[PDB]
Coordinates of C-alpha atoms and ligand atoms in Angstrom, one line a residue:
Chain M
X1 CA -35.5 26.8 14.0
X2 CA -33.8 23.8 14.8
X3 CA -32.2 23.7 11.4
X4 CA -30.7 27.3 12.9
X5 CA -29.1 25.0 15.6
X6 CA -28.1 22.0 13.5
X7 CA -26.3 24.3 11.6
X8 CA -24.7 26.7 14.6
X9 CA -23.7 23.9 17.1
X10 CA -19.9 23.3 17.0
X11 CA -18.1 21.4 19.3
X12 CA -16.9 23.5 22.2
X13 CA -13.3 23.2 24.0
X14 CA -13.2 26.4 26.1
X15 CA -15.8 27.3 28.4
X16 CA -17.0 30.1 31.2
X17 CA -16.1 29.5 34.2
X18 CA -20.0 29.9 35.3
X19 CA -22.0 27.2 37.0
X20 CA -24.8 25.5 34.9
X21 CA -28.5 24.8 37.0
X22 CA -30.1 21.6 37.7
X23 CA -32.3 23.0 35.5
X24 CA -30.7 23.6 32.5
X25 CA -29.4 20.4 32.5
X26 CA -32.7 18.7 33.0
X27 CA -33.9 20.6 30.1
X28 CA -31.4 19.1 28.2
X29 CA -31.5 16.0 29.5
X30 CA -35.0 15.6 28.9
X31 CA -34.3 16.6 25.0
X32 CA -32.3 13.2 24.8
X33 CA -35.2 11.1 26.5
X34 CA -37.2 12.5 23.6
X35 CA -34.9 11.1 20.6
X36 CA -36.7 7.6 18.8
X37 CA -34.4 4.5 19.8
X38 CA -35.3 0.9 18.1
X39 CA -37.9 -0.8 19.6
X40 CA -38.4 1.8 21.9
X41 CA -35.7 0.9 23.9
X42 CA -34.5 4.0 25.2
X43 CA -31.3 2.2 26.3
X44 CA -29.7 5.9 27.4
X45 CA -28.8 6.2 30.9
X46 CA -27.0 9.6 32.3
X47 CA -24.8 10.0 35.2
X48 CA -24.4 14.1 35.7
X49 CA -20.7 14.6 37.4
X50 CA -20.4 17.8 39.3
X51 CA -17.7 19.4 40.7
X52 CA -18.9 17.1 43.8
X53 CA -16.6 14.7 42.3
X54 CA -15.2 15.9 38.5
X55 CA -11.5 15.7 40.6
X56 CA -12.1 11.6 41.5
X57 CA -13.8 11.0 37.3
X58 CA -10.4 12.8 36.2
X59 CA -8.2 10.4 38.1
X60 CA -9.8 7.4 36.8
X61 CA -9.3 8.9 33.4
X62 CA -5.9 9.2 33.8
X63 CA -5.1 6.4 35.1
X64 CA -6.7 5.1 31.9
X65 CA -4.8 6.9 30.0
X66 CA -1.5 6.1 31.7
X67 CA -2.6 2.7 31.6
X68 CA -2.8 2.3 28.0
X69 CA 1.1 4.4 28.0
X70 CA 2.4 2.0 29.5
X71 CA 0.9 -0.8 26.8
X72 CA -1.4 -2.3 29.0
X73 CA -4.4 -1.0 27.3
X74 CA -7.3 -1.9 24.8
X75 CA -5.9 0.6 21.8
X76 CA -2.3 -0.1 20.6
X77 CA -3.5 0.8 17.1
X78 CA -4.5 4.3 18.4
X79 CA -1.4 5.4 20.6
X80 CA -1.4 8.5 18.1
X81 CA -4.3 9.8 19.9
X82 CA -3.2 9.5 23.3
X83 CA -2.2 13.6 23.1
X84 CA -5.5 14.1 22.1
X85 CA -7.4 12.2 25.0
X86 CA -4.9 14.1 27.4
X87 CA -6.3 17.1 25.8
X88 CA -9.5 15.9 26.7
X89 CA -9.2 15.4 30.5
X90 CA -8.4 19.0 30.7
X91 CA -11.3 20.0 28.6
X92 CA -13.4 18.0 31.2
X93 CA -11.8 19.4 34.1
X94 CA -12.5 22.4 32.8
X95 CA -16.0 22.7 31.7
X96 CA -18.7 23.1 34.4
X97 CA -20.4 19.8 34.1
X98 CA -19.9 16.3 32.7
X99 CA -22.7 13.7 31.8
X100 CA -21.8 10.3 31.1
X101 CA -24.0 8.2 28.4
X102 CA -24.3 4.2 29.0
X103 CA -26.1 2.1 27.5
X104 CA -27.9 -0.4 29.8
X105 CA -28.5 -2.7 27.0
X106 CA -24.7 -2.5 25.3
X107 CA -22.6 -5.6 25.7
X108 CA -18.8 -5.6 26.8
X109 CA -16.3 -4.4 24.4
X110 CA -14.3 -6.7 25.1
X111 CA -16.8 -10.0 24.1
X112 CA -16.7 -11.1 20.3
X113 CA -20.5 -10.7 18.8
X114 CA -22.3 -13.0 16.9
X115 CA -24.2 -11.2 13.8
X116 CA -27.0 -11.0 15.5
X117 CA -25.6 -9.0 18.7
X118 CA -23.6 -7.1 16.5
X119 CA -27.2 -5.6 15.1
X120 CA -28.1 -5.2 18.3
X121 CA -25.6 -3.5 19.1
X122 CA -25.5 -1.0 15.8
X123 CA -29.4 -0.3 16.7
X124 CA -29.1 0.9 20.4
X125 CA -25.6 2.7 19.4
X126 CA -27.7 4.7 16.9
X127 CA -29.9 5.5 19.1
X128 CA -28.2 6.5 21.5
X129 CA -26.3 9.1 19.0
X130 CA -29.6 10.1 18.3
X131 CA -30.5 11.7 22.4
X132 CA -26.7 12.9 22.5
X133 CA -27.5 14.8 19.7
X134 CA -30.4 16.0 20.9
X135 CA -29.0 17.1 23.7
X136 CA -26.3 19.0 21.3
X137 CA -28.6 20.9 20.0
X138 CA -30.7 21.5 22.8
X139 CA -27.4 22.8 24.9
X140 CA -27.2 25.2 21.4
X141 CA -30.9 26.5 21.9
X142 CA -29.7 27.3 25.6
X143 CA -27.3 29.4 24.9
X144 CA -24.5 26.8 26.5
X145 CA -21.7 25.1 24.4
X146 CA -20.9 21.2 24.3
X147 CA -18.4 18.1 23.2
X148 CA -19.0 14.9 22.6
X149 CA -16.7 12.6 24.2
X150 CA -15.3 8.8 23.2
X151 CA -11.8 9.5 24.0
X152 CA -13.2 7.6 27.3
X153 CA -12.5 5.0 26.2
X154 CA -9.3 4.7 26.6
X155 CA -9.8 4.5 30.3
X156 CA -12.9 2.3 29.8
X157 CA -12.7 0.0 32.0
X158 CA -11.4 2.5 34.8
X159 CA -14.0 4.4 34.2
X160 CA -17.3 1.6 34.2
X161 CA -15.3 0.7 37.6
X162 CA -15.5 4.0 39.2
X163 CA -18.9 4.5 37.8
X164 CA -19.7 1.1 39.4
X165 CA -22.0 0.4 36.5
X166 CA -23.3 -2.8 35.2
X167 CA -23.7 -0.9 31.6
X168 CA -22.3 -0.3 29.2
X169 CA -20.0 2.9 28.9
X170 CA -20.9 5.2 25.4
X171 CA -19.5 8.8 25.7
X172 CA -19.6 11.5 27.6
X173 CA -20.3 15.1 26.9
X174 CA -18.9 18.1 29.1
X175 CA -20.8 21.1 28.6
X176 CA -21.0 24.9 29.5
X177 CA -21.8 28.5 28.3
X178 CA -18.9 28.6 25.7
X179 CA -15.9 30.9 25.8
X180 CA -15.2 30.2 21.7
X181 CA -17.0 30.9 18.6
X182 CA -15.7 28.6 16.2
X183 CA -16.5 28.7 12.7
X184 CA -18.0 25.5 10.7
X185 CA -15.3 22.6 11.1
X186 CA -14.5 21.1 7.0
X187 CA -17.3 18.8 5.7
X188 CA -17.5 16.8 2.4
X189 CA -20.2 18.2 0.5
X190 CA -23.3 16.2 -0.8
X191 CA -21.9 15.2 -4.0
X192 CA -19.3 13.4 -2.2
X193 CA -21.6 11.6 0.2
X194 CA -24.7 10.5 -2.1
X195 CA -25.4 8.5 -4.8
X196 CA -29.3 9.1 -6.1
X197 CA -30.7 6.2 -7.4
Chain J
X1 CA -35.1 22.9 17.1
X2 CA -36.5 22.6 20.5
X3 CA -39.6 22.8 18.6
X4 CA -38.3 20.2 16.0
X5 CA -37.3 17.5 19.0
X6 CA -40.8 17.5 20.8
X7 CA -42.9 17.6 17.9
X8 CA -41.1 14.8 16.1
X9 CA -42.8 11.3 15.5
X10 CA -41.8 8.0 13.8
X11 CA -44.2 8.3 11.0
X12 CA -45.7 5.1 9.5
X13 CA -48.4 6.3 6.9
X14 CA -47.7 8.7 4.0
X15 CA -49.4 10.7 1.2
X16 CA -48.9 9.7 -2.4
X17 CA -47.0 13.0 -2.9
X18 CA -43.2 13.4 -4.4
X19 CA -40.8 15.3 -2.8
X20 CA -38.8 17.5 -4.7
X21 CA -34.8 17.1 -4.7
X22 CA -33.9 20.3 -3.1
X23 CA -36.3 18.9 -0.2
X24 CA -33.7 15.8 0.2
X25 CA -30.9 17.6 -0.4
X26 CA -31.6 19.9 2.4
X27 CA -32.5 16.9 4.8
X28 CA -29.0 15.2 3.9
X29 CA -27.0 19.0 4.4
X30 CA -28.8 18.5 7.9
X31 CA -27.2 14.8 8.2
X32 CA -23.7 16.0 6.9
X33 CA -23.6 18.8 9.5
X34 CA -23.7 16.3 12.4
X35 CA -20.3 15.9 14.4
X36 CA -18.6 13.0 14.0
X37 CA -15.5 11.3 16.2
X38 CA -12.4 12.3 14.4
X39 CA -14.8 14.3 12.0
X40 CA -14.0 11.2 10.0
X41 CA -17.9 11.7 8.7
X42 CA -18.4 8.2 7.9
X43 CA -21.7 8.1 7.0
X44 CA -22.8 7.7 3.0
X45 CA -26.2 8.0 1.6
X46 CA -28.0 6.2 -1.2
X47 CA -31.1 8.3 -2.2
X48 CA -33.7 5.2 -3.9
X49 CA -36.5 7.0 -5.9
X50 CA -40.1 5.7 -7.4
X51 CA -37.6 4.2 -10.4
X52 CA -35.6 2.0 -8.2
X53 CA -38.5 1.1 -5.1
X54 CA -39.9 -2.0 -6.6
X55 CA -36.3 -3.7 -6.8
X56 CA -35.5 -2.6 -3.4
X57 CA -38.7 -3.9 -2.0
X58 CA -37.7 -7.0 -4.0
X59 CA -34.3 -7.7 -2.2
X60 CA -35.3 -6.7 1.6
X61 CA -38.5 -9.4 0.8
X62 CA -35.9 -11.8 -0.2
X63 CA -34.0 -11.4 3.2
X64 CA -37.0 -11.4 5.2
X65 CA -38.0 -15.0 3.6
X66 CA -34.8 -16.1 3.9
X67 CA -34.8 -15.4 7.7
X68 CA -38.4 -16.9 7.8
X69 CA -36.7 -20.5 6.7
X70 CA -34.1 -20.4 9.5
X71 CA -31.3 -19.1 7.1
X72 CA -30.6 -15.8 8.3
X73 CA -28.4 -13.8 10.6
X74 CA -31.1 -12.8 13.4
X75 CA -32.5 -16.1 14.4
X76 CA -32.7 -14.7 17.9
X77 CA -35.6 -12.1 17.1
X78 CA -38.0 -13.9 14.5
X79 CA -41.0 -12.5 17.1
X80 CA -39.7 -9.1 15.6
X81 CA -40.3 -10.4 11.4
X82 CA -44.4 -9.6 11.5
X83 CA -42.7 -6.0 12.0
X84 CA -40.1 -6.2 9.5
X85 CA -42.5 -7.2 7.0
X86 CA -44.8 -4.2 7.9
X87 CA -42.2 -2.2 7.3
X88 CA -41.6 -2.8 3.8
X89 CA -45.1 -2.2 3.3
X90 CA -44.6 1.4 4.8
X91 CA -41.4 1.8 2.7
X92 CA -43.8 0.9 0.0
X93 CA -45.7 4.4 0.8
X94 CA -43.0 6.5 1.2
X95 CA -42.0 8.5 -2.1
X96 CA -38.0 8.4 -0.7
X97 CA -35.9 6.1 1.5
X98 CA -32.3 6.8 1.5
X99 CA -29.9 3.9 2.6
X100 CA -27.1 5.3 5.3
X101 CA -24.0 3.5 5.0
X102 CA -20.5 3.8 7.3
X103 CA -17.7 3.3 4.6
X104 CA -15.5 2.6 8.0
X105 CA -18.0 -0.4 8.9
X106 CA -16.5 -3.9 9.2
X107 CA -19.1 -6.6 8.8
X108 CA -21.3 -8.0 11.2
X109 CA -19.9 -11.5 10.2
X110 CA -16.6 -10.2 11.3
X111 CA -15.7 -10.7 15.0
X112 CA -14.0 -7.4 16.7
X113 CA -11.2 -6.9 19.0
X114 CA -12.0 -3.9 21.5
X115 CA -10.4 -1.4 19.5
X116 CA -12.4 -2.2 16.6
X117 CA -15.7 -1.9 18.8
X118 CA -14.4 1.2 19.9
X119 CA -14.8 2.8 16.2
X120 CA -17.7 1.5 15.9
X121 CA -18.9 2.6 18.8
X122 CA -17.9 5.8 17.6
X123 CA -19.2 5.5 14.1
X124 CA -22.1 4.3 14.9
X125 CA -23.0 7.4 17.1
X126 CA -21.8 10.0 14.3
X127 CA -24.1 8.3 12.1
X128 CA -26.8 8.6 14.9
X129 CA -26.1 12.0 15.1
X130 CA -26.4 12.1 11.4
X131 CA -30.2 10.2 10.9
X132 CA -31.0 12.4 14.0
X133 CA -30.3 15.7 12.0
X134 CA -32.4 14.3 8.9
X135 CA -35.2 13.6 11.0
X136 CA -35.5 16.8 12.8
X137 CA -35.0 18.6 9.6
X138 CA -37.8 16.3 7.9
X139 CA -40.1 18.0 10.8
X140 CA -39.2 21.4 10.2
X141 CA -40.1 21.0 6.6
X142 CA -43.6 19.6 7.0
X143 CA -42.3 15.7 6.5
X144 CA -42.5 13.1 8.2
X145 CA -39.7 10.0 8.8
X146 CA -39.6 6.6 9.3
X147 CA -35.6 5.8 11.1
X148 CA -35.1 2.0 9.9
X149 CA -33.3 -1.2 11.2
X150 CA -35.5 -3.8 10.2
X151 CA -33.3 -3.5 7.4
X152 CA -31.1 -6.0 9.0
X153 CA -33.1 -8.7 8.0
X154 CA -32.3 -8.4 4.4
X155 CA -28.5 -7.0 5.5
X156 CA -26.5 -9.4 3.1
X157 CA -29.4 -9.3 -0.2
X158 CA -28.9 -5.0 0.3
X159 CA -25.9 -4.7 0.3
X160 CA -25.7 -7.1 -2.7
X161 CA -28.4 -4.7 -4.3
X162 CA -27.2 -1.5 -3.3
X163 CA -23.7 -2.8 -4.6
X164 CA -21.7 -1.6 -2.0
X165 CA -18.6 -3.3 0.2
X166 CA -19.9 -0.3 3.2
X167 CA -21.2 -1.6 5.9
X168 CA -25.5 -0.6 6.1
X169 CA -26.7 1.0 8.9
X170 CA -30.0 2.2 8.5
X171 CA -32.5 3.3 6.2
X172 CA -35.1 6.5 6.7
X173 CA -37.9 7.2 4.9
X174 CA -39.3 10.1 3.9
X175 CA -42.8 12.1 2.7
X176 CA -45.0 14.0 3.8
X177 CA -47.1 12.6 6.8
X178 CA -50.9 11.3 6.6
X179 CA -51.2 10.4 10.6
X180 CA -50.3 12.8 13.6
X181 CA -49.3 9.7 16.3
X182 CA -49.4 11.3 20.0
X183 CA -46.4 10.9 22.0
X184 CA -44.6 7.3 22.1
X185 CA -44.0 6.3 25.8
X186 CA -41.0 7.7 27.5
X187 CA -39.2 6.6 30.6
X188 CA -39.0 10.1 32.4
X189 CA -35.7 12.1 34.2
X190 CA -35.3 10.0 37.3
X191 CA -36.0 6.7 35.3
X192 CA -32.9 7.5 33.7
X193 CA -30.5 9.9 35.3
X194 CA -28.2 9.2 38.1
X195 CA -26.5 12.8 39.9
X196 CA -23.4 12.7 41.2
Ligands
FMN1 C1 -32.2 3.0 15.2 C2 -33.7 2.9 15.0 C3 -34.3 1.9 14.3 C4 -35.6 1.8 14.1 N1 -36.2 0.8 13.3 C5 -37.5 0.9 13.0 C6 -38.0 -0.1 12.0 O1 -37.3 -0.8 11.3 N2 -39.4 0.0 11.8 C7 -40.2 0.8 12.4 O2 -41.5 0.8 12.2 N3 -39.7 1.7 13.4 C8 -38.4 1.7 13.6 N4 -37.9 2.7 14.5 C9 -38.8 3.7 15.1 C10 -39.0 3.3 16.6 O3 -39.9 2.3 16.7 C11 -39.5 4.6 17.3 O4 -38.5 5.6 17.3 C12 -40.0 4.3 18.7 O5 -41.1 3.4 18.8 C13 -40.4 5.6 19.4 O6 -41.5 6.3 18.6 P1 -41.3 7.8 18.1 O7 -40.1 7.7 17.3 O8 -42.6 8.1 17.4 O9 -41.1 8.6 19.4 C14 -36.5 2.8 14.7 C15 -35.9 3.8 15.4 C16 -34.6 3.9 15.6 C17 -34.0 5.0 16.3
FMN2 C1 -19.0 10.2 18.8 C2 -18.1 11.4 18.9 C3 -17.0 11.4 19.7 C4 -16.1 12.5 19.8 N1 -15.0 12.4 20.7 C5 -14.3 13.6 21.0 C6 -13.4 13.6 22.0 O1 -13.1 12.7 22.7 N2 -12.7 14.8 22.1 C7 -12.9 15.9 21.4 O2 -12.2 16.9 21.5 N3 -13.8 15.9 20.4 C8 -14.6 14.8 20.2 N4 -15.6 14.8 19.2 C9 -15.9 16.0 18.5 C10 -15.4 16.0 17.1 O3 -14.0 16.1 17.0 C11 -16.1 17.0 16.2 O4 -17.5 16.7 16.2 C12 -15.6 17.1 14.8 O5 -14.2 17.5 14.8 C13 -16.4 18.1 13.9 O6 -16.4 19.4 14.6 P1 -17.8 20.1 15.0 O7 -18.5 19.2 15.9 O8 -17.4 21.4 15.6 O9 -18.6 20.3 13.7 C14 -16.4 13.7 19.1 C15 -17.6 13.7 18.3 C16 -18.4 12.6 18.2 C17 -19.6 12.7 17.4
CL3 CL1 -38.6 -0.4 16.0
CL4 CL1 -12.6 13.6 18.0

């Protein structure tokens, strides 16, 4: 049942220590590939981070994240959630695997959009949601744990640098057989959300 | 759900069945359970019935025409009207399409500093997250989907229609399926997937 999953998944913060196969993360990589994306696009592109080099990602986060301390960053209106990206890193440097999501069709965040780009934009990032959360629910069906990840961006450019990507940078998700079981996080219910017309 | 994910298939042709509101409601109970950034759950859904189709066909016609006489907002991409224009025919077969909104969603007129692309970077994949859930649950309960952007050509005459100051993302619609399409082309792990 994957309305079993939808309905299980939570996000995941602590994880086993235990290593996660090639495998399983082909399994749930190929789960993503599978989502629709406009036009067929399939503007997704994955770059799995081991523990080959998790320690050299975590310093580009950081200095990211001290970057934007210091007020030389892209989100002054968000310095509030600085704690929480630091809480983050260590999530990531914790879990067993990392997989960052680009999108090789996404334009800088730092260029101003006409309409048109803008929709663009709004399509692929859908899209891409769409294999993430495929892959959510796949890692679910697996027995593994996972979080979703933008508090990368505020190390974004650090981190497209050490990526040495020419794409755009979307999330990333760290994932791992889970050491938490929490219960359902609040949600507004349906009345609160829908208007039937 | 492993199931759900393989099996599922942009559906383009539908009975002339109804679909009872308990069926919706459990699709959008799929959407709602998505995770979203901040859980800030931005997404908001307008559910359009047999009552209200003809006037939403109506207004996303309008848009398409208007973008047809070089006054719209996707002047880039009039190869891509033939297929808008198809689908409002399919949303013409479909018994339900519901109209997923972000309420955090500046417009597309609006030009963004990084920050603000940052939330909607971030919005916009909740919401993802969000049609993904419907879709999947559509599946699982015999129907098929139709996820919709072409919406955009008509983005300024639905949001007039639909009222709202939200920002639209998408449409879906939703019934249950009259073609079984094989698997759409996929780019496969290597394509796609970098190891480091
Ligand atoms: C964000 C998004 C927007 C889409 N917009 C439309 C649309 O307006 N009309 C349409 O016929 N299909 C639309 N599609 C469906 C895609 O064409 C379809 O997902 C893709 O061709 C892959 O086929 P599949 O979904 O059957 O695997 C959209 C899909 C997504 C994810
Ligand atoms: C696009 C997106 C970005 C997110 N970014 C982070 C993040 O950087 N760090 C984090 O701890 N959780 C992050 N989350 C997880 C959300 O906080 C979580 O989905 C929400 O609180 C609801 O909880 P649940 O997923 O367990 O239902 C993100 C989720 C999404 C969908
Ligand atoms: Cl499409
Ligand atoms: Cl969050």
């Amino acid at each position: 049942m994957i309305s079993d999953s939808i309905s299980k998944r939570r996000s995941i913060r602590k994880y086993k220590n235990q290593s996660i196969s090639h495998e399983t993360i082909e399994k749930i990589i190929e789960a993503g590939i599978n989502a629709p994306s406009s036009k067929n696009r399939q503007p997704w592109r994955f770059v799995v981070i081991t523990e080959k080099e998790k320690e050299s990602m975590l310093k580009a986060m950081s200095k990211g994240i001290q970057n934007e301390i210091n007020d030389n960053g892209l989100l002054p209106g968000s310095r509030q959630h600085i704690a929480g990206a630091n809480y983050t890193v260590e999530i990531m440097k914790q879990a067993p695997v990392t997989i960052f999501i680009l999108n090789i069709l996404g334009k800088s965040p730092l260029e101003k959009l006409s309409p048109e780009e803008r929709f663009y934009e709004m399509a692929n990032m859908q899209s891409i949601g769409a294999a993430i959360q495929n892959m959510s629910l796949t890692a679910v069906e697996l027995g593994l744990g996972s979080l979703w990840i933008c508090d990368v961006y505020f190390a974004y450019r650090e981190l497209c640098e050490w990526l040495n990507t020419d794409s755009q940078l979307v999330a990333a998700i760290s994932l791992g057989y889970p050491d938490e079981e929490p219960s359902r996080r609040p949600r507004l219910q349906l009345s609160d959300v829908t208007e039937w017309r």
